[PDB]
Amino acid sequence: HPAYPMPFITTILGGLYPSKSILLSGTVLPSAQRFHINLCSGNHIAFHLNPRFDENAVVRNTQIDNSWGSEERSLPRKMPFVRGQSFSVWILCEAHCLKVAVDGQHLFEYYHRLRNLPTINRLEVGGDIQLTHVQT
Numbered sequence: 001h002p003a004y005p006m007p008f009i010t011t012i013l014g015g016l017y018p019s020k021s022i023l024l025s026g027t028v029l030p031s032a033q034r035f036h037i038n039l040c041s042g043n044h045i046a047f048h049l050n051p052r053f054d055e056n057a058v059v060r061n062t063q064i065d066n067s068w069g070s071e072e073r074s075l076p077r078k079m080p081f082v083r084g085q086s087f088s089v090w091i092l093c094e095a096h097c098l099k100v101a102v103d104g105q106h107l108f109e110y111y112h113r114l115r116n117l118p119t120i121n122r123l124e125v126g127g128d129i130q131l132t133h134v135q136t
């Protein structure tokens with residue numbers, strides 16, 4: 001299985017709605033600094049999932065009208081992404097929030113800030129990973 005182009009951008013036809021899942025698989029590069037997965041709506045970023053290896057954290061935020069909101073960095077356990085290690089990310093959309101699992105285990109919830117779910121119709125992936133699969 002070859003790698004996807006990076007950055008990878010694709011339309012999510014129909015946008016989001018409760019029960020909608022977005023799955024991503026790949027491998028963190030050996031000396032990765034950071035990578036991100038964005039769910040976009042027009043010129044806004046409804047959800048920015050940003051693992052940072054330099055900061056050893058998983059940052060989540062929203063960018064509306066070019067302004068970043070308040071970051072969410074809370075984690076119930078140790079940073080699950082590891083340099084040079086393969087991973088899977090499952091983003092499940094619900095009515096009130098996005099539920100995110102990593103390597104098959106629930107990690108955190110992100111309450112919707114951009115609530116018109118059907119308008120969140122673009123996926124963008126970038127950064128220090130080798131993207132091996134996307135299920136939209």
Ligand code: NI
Pocket residue numbers: 133134135
């Ligand atoms: Ni496929």
